[model samples]
Target: SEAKRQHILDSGFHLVLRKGFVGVGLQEILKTSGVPKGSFYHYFESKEAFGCELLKHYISDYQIRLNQLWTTETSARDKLMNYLQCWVKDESCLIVKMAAEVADLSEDMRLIMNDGVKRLIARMADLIRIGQQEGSIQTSVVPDVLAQVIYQMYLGAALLSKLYKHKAPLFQALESTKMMLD
Candidate 1:
């Protein structure tokens, strides 16, 4: 039962990334996921609820990946670098891909997006704190403060990358992050 629910969630997430919230419809999701309307309704009250669930599922998967990245054998310094790289490299990521498109349309999805990104900022802050404590990262700025700034840069870069249809913005963001870390 839960597996079927997850299947619908996965389909919603894919459609959201490719088509944004208002752009996609239940018929499309049901058609692609091969799930019936009854199954979809059983899992989600409405399309807005589906979007919220999709965001949660998407963020949860990201949290898992971030947790894995944070626990690597490399110093917290390298882990931060790698995490930033992954953020830019993963263009399919829903946060930057669809956030602006849907934010004004759906308060429920926006709240979930806000919370999910905050969780990411907190994770980065924790990593920065570790790097500072261990002397691997030499930045003198406050960990949490710098983390938020860096996260913003990445977010902007992600949006720009989408706008320009190129990775130049991502490269610039990566360079800026390295300069900050160094």
Candidate 2:
């Protein structure tokens, strides 16, 4: 059934988020999903194929959320800050969780991730440009460039937070982004 396939995908996604692609095995995902290995093979040809589909699903979901975030507020800075705050609060970004673990292992996965991240940066740039028009965010730096650097900072902070097992780096990201806002 379609519902079963979705259940399997979502269950696998949760495992990937926690254990990463390399760390997670199909046995564990199938066990958790309550789907047998034979059924799994019927749905997906291999683990790599499953991962490709998983990235597309996850990325699409986030893109919708990002759209919602942008539409909610008048202040570009506020929208951007809110977005980062959610990441910090949740501490469970699938992209960030999966990137370091599998970016080098699969070219297809890397391309999907790269495309997703590029779209995110474009969305950020759009928000920054809107802020510039609204006279809240500065226009000194180009929107796309500024958005790229800001994303890098946040990603680095998230990685550091993982390394340190603390939220300090995320806090720093929030502070620095606040300062950069105006």
Candidate 3:
């Protein structure tokens, strides 16, 4: 049963990675996961609910991974910017692709997206505050708002990267950061 559940979750990740959320179907995931049809509803109330969890799982993992990287670097600015460097490395990554697809979908997608925005912006805002205190960042905008802007700007970079299937100018996301500091 545990194996089945794990397989199902793996399948769900794969489905989202390959087909995007709306394009992936329950039955298809069930079959691919080797999970039974009856088991699906036991784990998820609706695709909306499941998608929310999926988004949480993904963004949390991503945030944690970046946090780890930040720990190794000394400069606060470098710590944060190196986190964005992750985007360049992972331009073709699973989470970035799914995020691009879900952000503009329906209300459910927005629900998941909004949650990500809150968490991500909060984290970025905290880092911005640290930078400001260190005198590396100068900004009239509150840390939270500027953090949101940075998040949105990076998402825009991700969109461009996806459209061209390249990582060019994604680091310009740093300019968005620079504006806050200037």
Candidate 4:
């Protein structure tokens, strides 16, 4: 049952990725996932409920990937660089795609995204603190404050990249991030 539930979310995520939370319909998700309409209710109480679970799943999965990246045997500076590189290369990122669309659409969804973002920032701050100690990152800025600035910069860069349908902004952010750390 859990597998089936995950399958539905996996299919629905791709649909929401191309379209959006509002643009997608429950029937479309069911059809796309090959799950019978009746069975959908067995997994979720309502479409809103499903959307909540979907976002939670995405954030948890994303955190897992980030944890793996952070655990790698490398300098904190290298880990941060790799993180920005991943951000630049990940064109189909769910957070970038859904943050604006769903933030106002559902307060529940907004809270989930907000919490996920806060956790992400905290993790980055931890990495920055480690980098400062290792002498790889020479910045004297407070770790949490610097992490917040970096997150905002990259988030804005991602939006600009999408608007222009180019990765130039992302690369520019990457370089700027490197310079800041150096």
Candidate 5:
């Protein structure tokens, strides 16, 4: 009743994150949400559009939370470590879950994956630059390149964690971060 369209999107977000796009059907989503099919098309013209909207919503909210975590820390170095600490728990977050589920599916979903990676890359790159300026880090790699490497390492850990059914893969990520600095 409140923001019915957004309501649908939220439900879709959880469902998609759990089961993925191709793995789920329209009726299943509608049934799970207790939202009638009659009202569904009124909101989303297609599943692709619905997915794009869901990604935008999730990323926007996530960035707000991330900024607070990074900006509020007095030490840029500490903020960078705090960000990595986040991945220990955050690899299992809905953002990672959704990407894991749908990354191999539709081209639209792949595009969303690219967008999410770039979003994460930009944040880490900024943190790397900040740490360099503060003399807390030494790295010859460009901030952008280091960002990609960092993001790649985290994502690899997440994928392995899902496979292992635990965050054990994070040990490698944590270890690798130490050497990532020049």
Candidate 6:
């Protein structure tokens, strides 16, 4: 059943976040989800297949949340800042957690994650373009290029933050983001 499948994905998300894609086991996921072991095969042909679907579910759900944020009635720059602020505050991001661990492990997962990142970058670029028109964001750099740089910067910042067990890196990224946008 789709409901049971979604339940497994939901349970697996937290496990994957704390541990990584490879670190998580199908048995643990089923146990946590309270679904029987046999039901897992009914939903997914293999563990790798389950990972792919988990990523798809996460990417789509994440994009929907982003879309809702973008739709708010506020200055484009403010909207963009809010997006960045949320990034700083939230440490349980699935994409960042899985990117390094799963990218080289599975080609299929890598492509899915790559596509999701590109789509997010495109949206950020669009927001930057709007902010420029509104005179809230700097017009010196091209919106698309600026978006890409900011995205990469935050990605690095998140990694460093994780390594150091502190929020300093993310806070630094937040300040840098303000400088770039304003």
Best candidate, TM-score-wise?
4
lDDT of 1 by residue, 64-90 (tens): 888888776888889999988887766
**What TM-score against the true fold does each predicted structure earn?**
0.90, 0.90, 0.74, 0.93, 0.83, 0.91
Candidate 6: residue pairs that collide:
none
Candidate closer to the true structure by TM-score (higher is better), 1 or 4 = 4
lDDT by candidate, in order shown: 0.81, 0.83, 0.70, 0.88, 0.76, 0.85
Clashing pairs in 4: none
- Model 2, 1-182: lDDT tens digits are 88887888899888876878877788998898998899999999999899899888888889888888878746887888889998788624566776667635588888998898898889999988888888888757889899998999988888888889998998988988877876
Task: List pairs with backbone clashes in candidate 3.
Answer: none
lDDT for predicted candidate 1 compared with the true structure? 0.81
Give RMSD to native, each candidate: 1.9, 1.9, 3.6, 1.7, 2.8, 1.8
TM-score for candidate 2, residues paired by index: 0.90
Q: Which scores greater on TM-score, model 2 or model 5?
A: 2
| Pairs in clash, predicted candidate 2 | none
Among these predictions, the greatest lDDT belongs to 4
Off by over 4 Å in 3: 1-6, 39-42, 45-49, 91-109, 138-141, 174-182
In the range 1-182, model 3's lDDT, one tens digit per residue, is 66655556667877777778777677777777776777777877776667766666677776788678867737666767777776667624454666556545678667666676677778888888887788767676788888777777787787787778776757677666666568
Worst 10 residues of 2 by lDDT: 91-100
